[PDB]
Amino acid sequence: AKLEALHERHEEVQALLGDAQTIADQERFRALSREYAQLSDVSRCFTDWQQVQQLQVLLLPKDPDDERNAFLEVRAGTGGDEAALFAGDLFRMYSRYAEARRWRVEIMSASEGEHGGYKEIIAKISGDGVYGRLKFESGGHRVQRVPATESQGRIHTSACTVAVMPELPDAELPDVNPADLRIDTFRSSGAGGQHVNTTDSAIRITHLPTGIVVECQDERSQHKNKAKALSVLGARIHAAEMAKRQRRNSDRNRTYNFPQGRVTDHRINLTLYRLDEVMEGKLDMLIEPIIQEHQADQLA
Amino acid sequence: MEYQHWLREAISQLQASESPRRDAEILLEHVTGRGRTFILAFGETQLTDEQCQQLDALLTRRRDGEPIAHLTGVREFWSLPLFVSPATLIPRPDTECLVEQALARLPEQPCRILDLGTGTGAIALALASERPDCEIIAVDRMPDAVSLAQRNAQHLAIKNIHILQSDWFSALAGQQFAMIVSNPPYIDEQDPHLQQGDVRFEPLTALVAADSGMADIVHIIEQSRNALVSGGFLLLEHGWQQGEAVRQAFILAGYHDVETCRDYGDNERVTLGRYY
Numbered sequence: 148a149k150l151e152a153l154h155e156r157h158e159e160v161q162a163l164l165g166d167a168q169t170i171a172d173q174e175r176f177r178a179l180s181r182e183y184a185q186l187s188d189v190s191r192c193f194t195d196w197q198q199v200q201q202l203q204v205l206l207l208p209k210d211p212d213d214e215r216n217a218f219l220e221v222r223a224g225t226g227g228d229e230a231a232l233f234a235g236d237l238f239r240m241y242s243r244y245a246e247a248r249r250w251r252v253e254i255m256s257a258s259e260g261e262h263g264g265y266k267e268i269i270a271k272i273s274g275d276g277v278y279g280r281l282k283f284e285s286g287g288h289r290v291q292r293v294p295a296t297e298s299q300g301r302i303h304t305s306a307c308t309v310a311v312m313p314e315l316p317d318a319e320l321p322d323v324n325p326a327d328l329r330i331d332t333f334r335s336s337g338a339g340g341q342h343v344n345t346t347d348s349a350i351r352i353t354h355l356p357t358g359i360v361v362e363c364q365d366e367r368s369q370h371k372n373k374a375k376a377l378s379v380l381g382a383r384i385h386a387a388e389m390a391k392r393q394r395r396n397s398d399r400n401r402t403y404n405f406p407q408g409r410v411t412d413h414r415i416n417l418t419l420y421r422l423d424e425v426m427e428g429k430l431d432m433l434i435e436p437i438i439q440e441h442q443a444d445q446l447a
Numbered sequence: 448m449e450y451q452h453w454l455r456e457a458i459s460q461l462q463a464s465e466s467p468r469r470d471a472e473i474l475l476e477h478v479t480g481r482g483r484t485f486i487l488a489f490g491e492t493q494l495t496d497e498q499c500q501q502l503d504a505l506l507t508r509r510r511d512g513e514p515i516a517h518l519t520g521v522r523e524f525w526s527l528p529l530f531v532s533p534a535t536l537i538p539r540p541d542t543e544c545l546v547e548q549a550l551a552r553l554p555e556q557p558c559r560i561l562d563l564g565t566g567t568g569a570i571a572l573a574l575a576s577e578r579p580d581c582e583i584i585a586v587d588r589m590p591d592a593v594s595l596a597q598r599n600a601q602h603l604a605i606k607n608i609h610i611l612q613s614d615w616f617s618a619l620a621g622q623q624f625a626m627i628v629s630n631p632p633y634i635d636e637q638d639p640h641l642q643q644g645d646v647r648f649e650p651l652t653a654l655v656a657a658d659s660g661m662a663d664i665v666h667i668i669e670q671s672r673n674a675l676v677s678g679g680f681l682l683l684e685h686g687w688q689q690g691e692a693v694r695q696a697f698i699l700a701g702y703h704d705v706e707t708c709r710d711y712g713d714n715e716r717v718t719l720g721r722y723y
């Protein structure tokens with residue numbers, strides 16, 4: 148008697164729209180026609196709860212960036228060089244997953260662990276339905292393992308952070324770059340130009356205003372890293388007017404215990420005895436649930 | 448052997464480098480033809496014999512110090528892929544700055560540009576790319592540089608560019624361009640850098656200028672005069688320390704609107720003037 152309110156509006160709007168679609172019409176008959184393609188599934192159901200498991204129409208809480216590609220970075224925090232080492236594991240796990248389903252994973256900045264890991268590491272994953280599928284992976288990830296740099300066998304608790312921004316069509320970017328930003332160099336110093344030649348170029352960009360910081364480095368042209376950096380600043384900016392919006396799935400999200408081999412999403416009280424599987428690239432026995440879950444939340 | 452193994456091995460016997468992992472990863476990618484990410488996500492992969500042998504040769508070189516871009520033979524500049532060789536210089540990132548500053552000055556109306564000591568063809572190419580309405584002309588003294596330049600031009604498909612082999616202006620005898628750009632040799636015959644770095648394997652033909660690394664820069668600002676259109680610009684790249692210096696020869700030689708832009712390493716890289 149409350150939600151039905153909705154239908155008796157759609158079923159109404161659809162009827163309404165299915166009409167205009169039969170009059171002399173050109174131009175953006177696209178926008179309107181497409182709406183029809185939408186109101187058609189939602190409508191075809193209502194016109195049955197009436198003509199009759201009454202599949203509760205979940206066809207209502209729309210989404211946006213879901214299909215857009217995505218940037219993902221892993222940061223090292225708690226724990227010694229132990230943590231950065233898990234930054235590696237985590238990052239593999241993702242890329243091992245992004246491949247299993249043919250996504251374009253491309254790094255754009257790496258921070259060699261002070262002893263074999265990554266302080267940072269940020270890939271540019273690509274394929275359909277990316278963001279809406281790894282977003283939940285944002286937050287904090289904690290490991291409890293027994294280091295190879297330890298024989299007495301006592302577990303060591305270290306942790307990593309994970310940001311999962313969205314891929315904005317750089318052909319949409321707000322040209323947020325007059326002089327309101329400071330483009331710097333990684334070179335703690337140097338003569339530059341002819342005097343020296345390194346194997347790869349590293350740029351850095353700071354947003355004077357909001358203060359955002361982005362940087363990149365690879366074997367390619369500076370021109371490219373920079374422009375590459377401009378695209379990440381943007382994704383980092385749009386990552387503000389999203390975190391602005393106030394169970395809204397570092398904040399311990401999961402914990403990976405190896406002596407037990409379990410993984411646990413604190414966020415939905417789910418623990419699976421399948422760490423092996425999750426570390427090799429099987430992030431669906433996790434993303435799927437936190438997804439249906441984040442679903443029901445919306446179904447209210 | 449395993450990609451993960453090799454990478455582990457090489458990085459070891461490659462400590463004298465400023466970027467062992469990278470050097471490593473690049474090499475391994477080059478031979479196997481698998482990107483960074485792949486190598487990282489799948490270190491279990493074995494190397495076919497060749498690869499291992501091929502990877503080996505390249506690795507020795509790199510231990511002897513041979514530049515990476517020299518081993519893989521390529522270099523990106525302006526997001527443009529350039530083949531490089533010890534025939535000339537390996538296009539630097541700071542040189543991209545020269546290009547940046549030169550793109551502004553350029554007249555909104557289609558015109559002709561000159562590139563002295565084009566080398567790989569870096570600057571000239573990037574420009575003829577941005578301004579497809581302008582005819583650029585790159586010349587070089589070494590005959591081999593002329594070819595690498597032409598080779599890049601071909602591979603790249605840029606046709607509004609033309610390579611010649613003059614000694615500064617010899618072949619240009621009688622032409623005048625809107626803007627004249629040039630990164631000439633500006634290293635002292637005995638700067639301690641020549642001592643170290645990949646720069647050990649780069650040619651002096653392109654590294655050393657005379658008069659304590661200042662000989663060419665000046666001889667050009669001098670010459671450039673008789674070849675610049677009304678109020679056209681002349682902009683040169685120089686050493687980080689030749690800041691004030693170059694500025695003066697620019698004023699002394701008689702150049703209007705002198706200036707000295709700085710690159711991202713926050714050094715002084717390009718000095719630009721004008722003429723009437």
Ligand SMILES: Nc1ncnc2c1ncn2[C@@H]1O[C@H](CSCC[C@H](N)C(=O)O)[C@@H](O)[C@H]1O
Nearest residue numbers: 536538564566567569587588614615630653
């Ligand atoms: N008299 C002369 N005429 C033309 N080129 C000259 C010259 N004397 C030296 N050179 C050229 O000066 C160049 C200096 S290095 C120029 C490199 C170029 N900017 C790059 O990014 O690759 C060399 O290519 C050298 O062959």
